[PDB]
Amino acid sequence: APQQINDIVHRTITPLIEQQKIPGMAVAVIYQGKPYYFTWGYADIAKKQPVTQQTLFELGSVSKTFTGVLGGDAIARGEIKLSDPTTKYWPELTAKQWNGITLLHLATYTAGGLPLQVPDEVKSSSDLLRFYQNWQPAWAPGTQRLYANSSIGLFGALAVKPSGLSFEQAMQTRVFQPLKLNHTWINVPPAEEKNYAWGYREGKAVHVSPGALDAEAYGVKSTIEDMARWVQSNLKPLDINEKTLQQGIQLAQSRYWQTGDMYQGLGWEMLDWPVNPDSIINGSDNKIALAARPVKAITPPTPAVRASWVHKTGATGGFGSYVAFIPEKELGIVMLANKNYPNPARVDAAWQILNALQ
Ligand SMILES: *[B]([O])([O])[C][N]S(=O)(=O)[C]C1=[C][C]=[C]C(C([O])=O)=[C]1
């Protein structure tokens, strides 16, 4: 690999792994469109299995970017509109607070205070209907952003209804397959189990627990190679041959709302490049990222801006992921680790690497 990339990546990631006690990590840098890969440490500490370019990691909320793109593809297909009331796709949702809450609100966490988690107590489909029917918004729709699995998770489930496909079926056939993401999974198959890293939480090996709307909000697992290809696809959607998918990727990077210096896409979040690193670094801390913030509607949404830092953090109990890219520069990074370590450390390392390469 070019020595510049080798040095920049190793000088940043090595101390990060040491400081954060990360058991295993994979990184891809996309530079001028081509991927370069780096691996450290262990997928499975007990069985002494190293991290490789084929290791599967839990993406956590990086999964929201796939959900956003799949939703975008459904809009491009003419199956849904972001302006369509939620109740159009879930007629049983008759409670009055849902009047005026659209698919856009669900996709972008602006429905008016849907909670971060779906309660663990929600096990059945009737439990899910009950939860949404009884939910009381704190705010009018489209006025405040509150990051939430229960918001974009519902969006994903409703977005695929017109297709008649399950969420998993829709994701596989409309996103994973056309992009040749052949080691990316919502449910890790037995054939790929030997590659599935353990996550580590307080020293214990863990995998993500089953839960309501898990697939839609945080349930994707992938390898560093497939994630590099995901970044390439989002960097350059015009190279994608499937028209609705190309369009969906573009829609997911449109700017729908602004809060402070960040813009909300579908799954993706974006800031103007050049960024103030303190802004993205401090902004990624869950103390800010998960806060209720007033939003300004972008009316109409700005189409994907090439001079953007586009990114998403993801976590599960045992895993911590980060993806960031800058379309204008054909530059990006994926960092996948089997420990959920603090977001600002992820973003700081990412910015150090991309800034040195740009
Ligand atoms: B995203 O990364 O912001 C979502 N993160 S998460 O921690 O909410 C994902 C999640 C939800 C429920 C259970 C688990 C788990 O690891 O068992 C993870």
Side-chain angles (χ1 to χ4, degrees), residues 1-3 5-17 20 22-33 35-95 97-120 122 124-192 194-200 203 205-235 237-242 244-295 297-327 329-358:
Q3 192 170 23
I5 295 181
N6 178 91
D7 294 347
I8 289 164
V9 173
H10 283 287
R11 78 161 83 117
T12 303
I13 299 301
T14 288
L16 172 72
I17 290 170
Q20 297 297 332
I22 290 165
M25 191 155 184
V27 168
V29 170
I30 297 75
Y31 177 85
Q32 294 179 354
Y36 301 91
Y37 299 107
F38 306 87
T39 54
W40 296 257
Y42 287 87
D44 180 336
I45 292 176
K47 294 186 178 173
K48 291 169 185 179
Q49 298 297 305
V51 173
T52 74
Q53 292 175 201
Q54 297 75 36
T55 297
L56 289 168
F57 287 85
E58 298 178 358
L59 302 185
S61 297
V62 171
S63 299
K64 291 169 173 69
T65 71
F66 287 97
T67 296
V69 171
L70 179 65
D73 172 88
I75 298 160
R77 285 172 182 269
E79 288 172 352
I80 65 170
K81 299 187 302 201
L82 289 175
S83 58
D84 267 349
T86 298
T87 56
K88 174 165 180 173
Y89 305 97
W90 203 359
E92 294 73 0
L93 207 59
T94 56
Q97 70 270 25
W98 288 92
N99 299 335
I101 298 179
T102 65
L103 294 186
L104 177 62
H105 298 132
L106 296 180
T108 57
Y109 323 117
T110 51
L114 279 168
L116 176 58
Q117 304 290 355
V118 182
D120 238 273
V122 169
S124 69
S125 65
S126 64
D127 285 344
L128 197 65
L129 172 65
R130 215 144 24 229
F131 162 69
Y132 287 106
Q133 283 278 76
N134 289 329
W135 164 76
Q136 300 296 122
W139 316 293
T143 62
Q144 299 206 221
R145 178 184 179 275
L146 180 63
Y147 179 84
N149 295 324
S150 73
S151 186
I152 194 175
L154 181 57
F155 171 72
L158 297 185
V160 295
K161 281 179 108 164
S163 75
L165 294 173
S166 70
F167 184 83
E168 184 177 26
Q169 294 180 314
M171 191 69 75
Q172 285 170 327
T173 62
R174 304 181 161 186
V175 179
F176 296 167
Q177 281 167 23
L179 297 179
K180 303 177 162 46
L181 309 185
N182 298 320
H183 300 90
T184 299
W185 312 103
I186 283 164
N187 291 295
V188 176
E192 318 293 337
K194 69 180 187 297
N195 285 313
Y196 190 7
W198 283 99
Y200 290 92
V206 299
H207 280 150
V208 62
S209 290
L213 301 177
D214 55 1
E216 293 88 351
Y218 53 82
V220 179
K221 296 93 196 184
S222 194
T223 66
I224 195 68
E225 293 190 352
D226 275 11
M227 288 307 296
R229 193 164 176 89
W230 180 234
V231 169
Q232 287 173 313
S233 297
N234 280 269
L235 271 167
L238 298 189
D239 286 343
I240 295 175
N241 290 330
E242 296 74 13
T244 59
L245 182 58
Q246 164 178 138
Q247 191 170 339
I249 286 167
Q250 293 167 310
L251 293 169
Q253 278 175 62
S254 290
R255 301 171 172 201
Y256 296 92
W257 308 92
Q258 177 177 13
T259 164
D261 63 354
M262 67 78 40
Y263 299 89
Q264 182 64 58
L266 310 179
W268 294 113
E269 295 168 21
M270 289 85 51
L271 297 85
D272 290 316
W273 177 264
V275 292
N276 170 12
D278 283 359
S279 188
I280 54 164
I281 291 165
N282 294 335
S284 71
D285 193 304
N286 287 329
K287 299 172 185 169
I288 289 171
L290 300 180
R293 293 293 176 84
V295 284
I298 306 175
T299 305
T302 308
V305 181
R306 274 170 66 62
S308 290
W309 176 274
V310 184
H311 71 160
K312 185 73 187 84
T313 59
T316 60
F319 288 84
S321 63
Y322 183 58
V323 174
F325 61 90
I326 304 164
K329 302 290 188 189
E330 319 172 53
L331 185 54
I333 190 174
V334 180
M335 297 156 63
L336 305 179
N338 60 354
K339 178 176 182 174
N340 177 17
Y341 66 103
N343 288 328
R346 310 185 198 176
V347 184
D348 170 87
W351 187 87
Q352 286 289 359
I353 291 167
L354 297 193
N355 190 63
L357 292 170
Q358 140 260 18

